[PDB]
Amino acid sequence: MKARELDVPGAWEITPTIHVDSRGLFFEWLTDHGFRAFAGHSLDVRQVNCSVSSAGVLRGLHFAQLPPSQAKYVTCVSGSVFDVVVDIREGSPTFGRWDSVLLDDQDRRTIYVSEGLAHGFLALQDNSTVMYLCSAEYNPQREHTICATDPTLAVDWPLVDGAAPSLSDRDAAAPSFEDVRASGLLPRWEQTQRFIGEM
Amino acid sequence: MKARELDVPGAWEITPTIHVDSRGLFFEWLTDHGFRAFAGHSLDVRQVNCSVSSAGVLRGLHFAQLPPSQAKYVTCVSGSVFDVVVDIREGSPTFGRWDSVLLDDQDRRTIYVSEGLAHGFLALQDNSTVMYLCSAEYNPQREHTICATDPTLAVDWPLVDGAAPSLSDRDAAAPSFEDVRASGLLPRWEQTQRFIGEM
């Protein structure tokens, strides 16, 4: 429990309070009281996803179109991943900027990624399990991708054994950011804030 | 997927559809559409807990007082645990009965435990991580315990294949089940169902 807003506003690194005893350890990954503190409203969890990745695999970068969009509360429960958030909300003063947080089974952090941002992660270890809560159910029709290695975003992805990333087919064929920007599919800063402006 | 009501009504074993590819694997641990199918309403997630346990460690048996008690959607993401649900609902035709499901990082099952039941699990391996979604925030004043080895329940714990099990001070001193029934702290079958059959 310290929630630390990232350099992209609307995305937070959460560190839990870990109680350790003879049995091992426990913690609160999420509490309504705790989340409400920093996000300003309660998370309604409409889906939770799980994945396990081998070293070097990259999933992202993903977003959901704004009327609902899809907020994400994301943690690593085995191995480690380098997780990245991107400000795709045209009009925003951090538009085009990204930040990362390190999710592992040692510090056990979480990133919360609010509505209308893009998100992705690179596994750094075999048997890297990522679990994440979502505010909307998966919707193929309103989910989109931006290529993870886009040169305008120029995300500083680490590489494993100096080895290039393993991605899915759809992630590998993802359009470019100025290809998605021009096609009108990015969220607007003003309209995300009004949707979150609900409470 | 597969949701299979246990021999205690109101508790279910869930098996996911696991997509495997070159990156590893992924699945939907929960979807609203899928949960509603069997529970008959949506899970209001107000807390998510996480624990990691060494071999032989036993946590439970726990229940929450009705209005509004604490339903639990529970899974193992590393190692394995033997998970037990007990019907503590006075008046129920299965009053005093229990069932188990095996949660592990092989089959990746889940047990859903509705309002007014008691729940516990035994870790069968080092580095056994359990995560669970909860319909209520933790409330110490309304959470009660029943001794896990209560002779009336006679739960069949699997590791009188070595050692006695390892517990915390509160679970070790938990009151037995006639201690808890005569003190009138148990849910009533009729009123758990009125709370649930309300959706």
Side-chain angles (χ1 to χ4, degrees), chain A:
Chain A
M1 257 271 102
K2 57 195 98 200
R4 171 183 68 94
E5 185 159 40
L6 295 172
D7 294 345
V8 174
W12 279 262
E13 179 186 79
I14 289 103
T15 306
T17 292
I18 295 166
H19 306 287
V20 179
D21 60 18
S22 61
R23 296 166 319 161
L25 65 80
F26 57 99
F27 64 104
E28 301 172 334
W29 177 27
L30 187 143
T31 58
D32 193 68
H33 68 252
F35 180 96
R36 263 182 96 87
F38 83 71
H41 70 267
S42 299
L43 193 61
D44 85 335
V45 173
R46 273 187 139 168
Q47 183 163 324
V48 192
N49 288 342
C50 184
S51 72
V52 187
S53 302
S54 58
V57 0
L58 214 173
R59 303 186 198 253
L61 301 161
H62 286 273
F63 71 105
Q65 265 175 311
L66 168 59
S69 198
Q70 201 187 211
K72 289 154 192 182
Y73 196 80
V74 190
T75 205
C76 188
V77 296
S78 72
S80 37
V81 308
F82 179 93
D83 189 289
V84 159
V85 59
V86 187
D87 191 344
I88 53 162
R89 309 166 290 198
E90 346 199 43
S92 182
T94 36
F95 177 64
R97 307 304 138 69
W98 62 275
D99 206 353
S100 72
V101 6
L102 177 55
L103 315 174
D104 54 24
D105 64 345
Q106 295 300 106
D107 299 300
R108 309 201 180 260
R109 301 175 192 97
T110 290
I111 183 165
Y112 176 66
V113 176
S114 61
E115 279 83 4
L117 296 162
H119 165 253
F121 72 79
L122 172 60
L124 312 164
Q125 255 179 136
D126 289 351
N127 201 200
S128 291
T129 302
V130 167
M131 168 141 283
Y132 69 87
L133 316 179
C134 295
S135 61
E137 285 181 301
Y138 160 67
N139 181 120
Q141 181 171 188
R142 302 205 71 75
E143 248 203 88
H144 301 285
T145 311
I146 292 156
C147 167
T149 60
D150 177 76
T152 298
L153 304 181
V155 171
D156 199 323
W157 294 106
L159 337 86
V160 172
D161 298 62
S166 180
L167 310 106
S168 71
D169 277 0
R170 176 169 167 199
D171 286 352
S176 273
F177 182 65
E178 311 265 276
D179 272 358
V180 174
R181 199 208 77 171
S183 110
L185 288 167
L186 293 184
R188 324 186 108 71
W189 173 235
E190 289 314 61
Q191 71 184 208
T192 52
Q193 295 289 85
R194 180 193 101 159
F195 188 82
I196 294 186
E198 176 181 297
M199 293 180 75

Side-chain angles (χ1 to χ4, degrees), chain B residues 127-147:
Chain B
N127 219 78
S128 292
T129 306
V130 172
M131 174 124 283
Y132 63 86
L133 317 173
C134 294
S135 73
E137 286 191 280
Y138 176 76
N139 179 317
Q141 174 163 206
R142 289 161 77 70
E143 259 249 321
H144 301 277
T145 310
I146 296 156
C147 177

Side-chain angles (χ1 to χ4, degrees), chain B residues 38-195:
Chain B
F38 79 71
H41 63 270
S42 295
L43 196 56
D44 186 23
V45 180
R46 322 203 82 243
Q47 183 167 329
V48 194
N49 282 348
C50 187
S51 71
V52 188
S53 310
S54 56
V57 154
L58 224 170
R59 303 179 197 250
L61 298 161
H62 281 273
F63 75 99
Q65 206 152 321
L66 203 61
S69 194
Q70 200 188 46
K72 280 142 191 191
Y73 197 79
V74 188
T75 205
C76 191
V77 299
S78 65
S80 43
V81 318
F82 179 95
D83 192 285
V84 163
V85 59
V86 184
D87 190 347
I88 54 160
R89 312 164 290 193
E90 296 188 65
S92 185
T94 33
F95 181 60
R97 297 282 302 223
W98 67 273
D99 208 348
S100 83
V101 5
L102 173 62
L103 307 177
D104 63 7
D105 64 351
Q106 310 295 121
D107 296 303
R108 307 199 180 262
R109 287 178 288 251
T110 290
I111 183 165
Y112 176 62
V113 185
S114 47
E115 283 86 4
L117 294 160
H119 169 251
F121 75 82
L122 174 63
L124 310 167
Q125 253 173 115
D126 289 336
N127 219 78
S128 292
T129 306
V130 172
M131 174 124 283
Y132 63 86
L133 317 173
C134 294
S135 73
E137 286 191 280
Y138 176 76
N139 179 317
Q141 174 163 206
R142 289 161 77 70
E143 259 249 321
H144 301 277
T145 310
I146 296 156
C147 177
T149 60
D150 185 71
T152 312
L153 304 179
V155 171
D156 207 301
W157 293 107
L159 197 122
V160 346
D161 274 321
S166 290
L167 313 94
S168 63
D169 294 13
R170 185 172 169 185
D171 298 346
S176 256
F177 173 79
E178 334 276 70
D179 279 350
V180 174
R181 189 192 130 270
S183 121
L185 285 165
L186 289 184
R188 294 121 112 161
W189 170 251
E190 265 305 39
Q191 96 205 170
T192 57
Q193 313 235 102
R194 173 184 209 70
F195 190 86

